Amino acid sequence: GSSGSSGTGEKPFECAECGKSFSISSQLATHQRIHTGEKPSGPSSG
């Protein structure tokens, strides 16, 4: 018996920094900005 059905409106463009979301990329980009600035690792992802 494994029960557990729920939903909080998911999306393809989710933010794993604060907990936000968007519909298109442009929207997500303009956001990530507030996140882009620190120095987590040496070089950049790509």
- Residue selected from 11, 12, 14, 17 as contacting Zn ion according to rule CB under 5 A: 17
Letter for the amino acid at 35? Answer: H
Least distance CB 42 / Zn ion (angstroms): 23
Q: Does 18 bind Zn ion (CB under 5 A)?
A: yes
Q: Does 14 bind Zn ion (CB under 5 A)?
A: no
Give start and end residues of each alpha helix (H) in 1-46: 25-35
CA–CA dist 44, 8 (Å, integer): 32
Name residues whose C-beta falls within 8 Å of residue 17's C-beta, 6 or more positions apart in sequence.
32, 35
Q: Does 28 bind Zn ion (CB under 5 A)?
A: no
Residues within the interface to Zn ion (CB under 5 A)? 15, 17-18, 20
